[PDB]
Symmetry: D2
Subunit: 287 residues, 4 copies
């Protein structure tokens, strides 16, 4: 019943992760103790911690219309796109790039150097990658530190869950209609998939990573480019899911290959177990 | 930024609630720090705390085949049916009756004297009623105490969420098929409902209480009496939802009116906002 | 086992207390998780929280050589003298005055409008007065809030503890030698006092408040004006102890009547139960 | 800012330590949330956890007149003498022996196989030895686990603190009078020692371990065999202090060599830095 602790390592990049984690720890505490005030609060925490890391030059926040330029004295080599408080478990999402303007935060997901999400549940969980797989951490609030709980997390090749808001059925495009119909009425004599949809993206993506299956927020008639934001929701989770052996697509190309045309750009998002996402792509190509 | 605390009151019944809350506090801590071992653990906590209250004579647990008879020395006037660890937020569910045998735990829900659930999320939340409405509490683990956060909680007359596993579509009975079709394709020119389904009953019911709408685990071809257990899942949440101004039905009668034929009996469960449950009943009566 | 919470009230003064408490909550967390770095850290927390209250114009910190002048935009009517991390339980001490220069922080203790200390033990405790007695609070870190635990705390008229570093005996002045001799060898056939000395001033003063008796850090040959600092150690605790019915003296006048000649001025400090401090004064007057 | 955790190891003995730690974690929580009821509570926690380890045959508790004999089914090879709640930081003290009667708990300290104390401060700290030095742990209540913070703790050869209740001066024996006089008036031109006395034995002993110096509760006229209890206060701390390179004596023999004549036997206790305890012994031998 006794433990020893050891520092874990995945310069400026490490200091930058360290401060992003410190802001997540603060947000975790502010969520445990709890709407727009909490969003405003979570935003200042990230921005201010990120800036005083001395590792940033450009921030993009879901909460701010324009990119935020780090004061010239505190400037470093990295760009951070984040959703401070997304969404039941709500979350925080971020992706880090190397670079002094918006140009720098408009790089395709392929260029990501580190990305992560935090999920604020019974425990605060962080999934993190710096390009060499996905590691899962739990916030130990007693220590003030994040504890490694799983190394090199891998998603199942194929799952048995599908996850989307089916209340948008009347608006679905033909490929989504077809895919959902196949999940409920398999044509191969297999059992239908189970359905799960928390309605909080970080909660649904995290379940998709650890249980397998597929998560979808595709284009539909009311949102013809999807709802979820490319820079600081879709690209970071696509990066995490790909690092875990999964796939993430807009329907017509990998999310990480999309060339961003604006910082608050939305894209469709379909991700998860590779065989499930490939079967979704087949419905697209056929329609 | 300073507070005063005051003891809240909703003899033996109070001591019984007090120990059920103490077991919930212990379960909360064991969940935060985390599968069958946790179920075994949560079970002993409830059973042992409930017994040493000196208020029980008969327990029914989701985990135990037979009813548990309190030792003759520790016996009191009450019967408790509970699911120690149900299920993402998992939960604990319980209902309390006045009474020395199984007979006593086979009373219809109408006879309930107190019921509740706990939800183990970013915060541990307890909904509780003793017949005079629903009160919502948060576990303050620093104090070891449950803090009143909402008095006399009322569910909306009509919501805009529907909540069920649509992966069972191929197995749905005609009334469920019809109801779901109406939620997605309203015939009155209104917007379709949104869909949410966490797949943990306490999580879905709690959302249904605070946001409004409808939750369904109806009979289907694979589970022709439903999945959820009458004594310690369906009756307690039906009791809470009715105390909040909602409805809870098996499709053919109020859950609380069902006369239990066995302690692990399953029933269908449809509950939530009264106008939503009434519209579901209309699809049943018409089929 | 259930509680209700109610906001407690003892404009700018309230916002100022609120931020001083918020800095104490942060310091509490940084102490739980733990030397000069912690002092530097505790200092920035107080200074920065105090400044953004918009209620301060002048700060005096044990950690800073010169008084700190609040930026003109954030200025308010109050002056705060504090020891961010003093000292086994360590503590934080502060006193608040109404006022733009050092002049304002050089007022005698008599002018204090609010004062307090925090003690970081198994629980974090705050004693606070705004002139109408002493109230005791515990930090509930789960809530992020301070909970009233005792109202209008009163010190015993006479105690049975004396508290001083007797390792300075060879340096004691004649009155301290005489007083200590009387505590150990009572001339009235009473039992000797017990001795307690934690060596952390907030710990010893707090014990003196709740158990009664006397605490002394008098002048001696090596420290002929005492060790403890007038502005942000001696005046605040003198204010608290007097508000609890006790006395606090330098030996030759009440601490609160001393006219400060510099912001880091030291004074002797003798305080506690009034009859004990009066007996100490008798030894002084006689020598 | 990320950590990995690793199980630490110092069969039945390990399970026994594990349960003693689990009772300390429970006591820590009950102290944080707080007199005789807490003593009664702390006692049942130790006794019940110790018994269900299946490693005990005989317990001796400061709280119970007679030794407690483990039920025949749960019996194992070890004997545990403990003070569940001693005493400002209060503590828990225990020593473990291999063995079915009182005989087994009346072994001299020399036979100890493991001993420890817990101190309930801003953090809950455990000092533990199983014969190969002293290791220091902090309770991480988030994890529910004890974290190694210092390995093979060593006390200074000679310190500059002395720690005793000087309010018993009129009752001191000649050697204690002489020793204290030498601490305050060194005859070698060195500075006087500082004095510290919390009045809680675990607090004073812990300070003595980490800062060095000497702690004394010697025989005096009112307590001619001392106050502190041999089996579950003096022997465990003597064992810890000796494992850290210190000494612990009654004045006339090492505490660990005293042959116990009764389970609640008191002995004088002088311990700490070896050169300080040796100088105390010189005052004894000379008187
Ligand atoms: O209610 P909808 O249309 O399903 O939206 C769900 C999505 O909206 C958000 O709450 C907003 O980002 C996401 O977290 C979630 O995936
Ligand atoms: O996976 P299904 O068939 O939707 O089952 C969901 C239900 O099963 C449970 O996990 C078991 O009680 C419930 O908490 C939940 O409502
Ligand atoms: O070691 P000494 O001289 O007794 O000093 C004790 C005093 O020093 C301090 O640690 C410094 O402020 C006080 O907290 C305490 O009262
Ligand atoms: O008040 P006294 O006589 O100094 O007693 C102090 C001792 O008493 C106790 O509180 C009782 O065990 C010890 O923790 C402490 O060492």
């Amino acid at each position: 019943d006794m433990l020893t602790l050891t520092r874990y390592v995945m310069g400026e990049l490490t200091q930058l992760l360290n401060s992003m984690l410190t802001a997540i720890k603060a947000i975790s505490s502010a969520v445990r103790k709890a709407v727009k005030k909490l969003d405003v609060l979570s935003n200042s925490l990230v921005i201010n911690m990120l800036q005083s890391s001395y590792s940033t030059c450009v921030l993009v926040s879901e909460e701010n219309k324009d990119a935020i330029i780090t004061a010239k004295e505190k400037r470093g080599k990295y760009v951070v796109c984040f959703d401070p408080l997304d969404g039941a478990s709500i979350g925080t999402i971020f992706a880090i790039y190397r670079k002094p303007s918006e140009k720098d935060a408009l790089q395709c997901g392929r260029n990501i150097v580190a990305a992560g999400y935090a999920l604020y549940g019974s425990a605060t969980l962080v999934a993190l990658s710096t390009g060499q797989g996905v590691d899962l951490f739990m916030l130990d609030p007693a220590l003030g530190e994040f504890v490694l709980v799983e190394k090199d997390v891998k998603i199942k090749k194929k799952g048995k869950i599908y996850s989307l808001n089916e209340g948008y059925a009347k608006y679905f495009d033909a490929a989504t209609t077809e895919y959902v119909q196949k999940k409920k009425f398999p044509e191969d004599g297999s059992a239908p998939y189970g359905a799960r949809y928390v309605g909080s993206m970080v909660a649904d993506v995290h379940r998709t990573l650890v249980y397998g299956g597929i998560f979808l927020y595709p284009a539909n008639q009311k949102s013809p480019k999807g709802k979820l934001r490319l820079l600081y929701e879709c690209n970071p989770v696509a990066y995490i899911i790909e690092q875990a052996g999964g796939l993430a697509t807009t329907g017509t190309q990998p999310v990480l290959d999309v060339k961003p045309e604006a910082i608050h750009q939305r894209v469709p998002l379909i991700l998860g177990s590779p065989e499930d996402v490939q079967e979704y792509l087949t419905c697209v190509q056929k329609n």
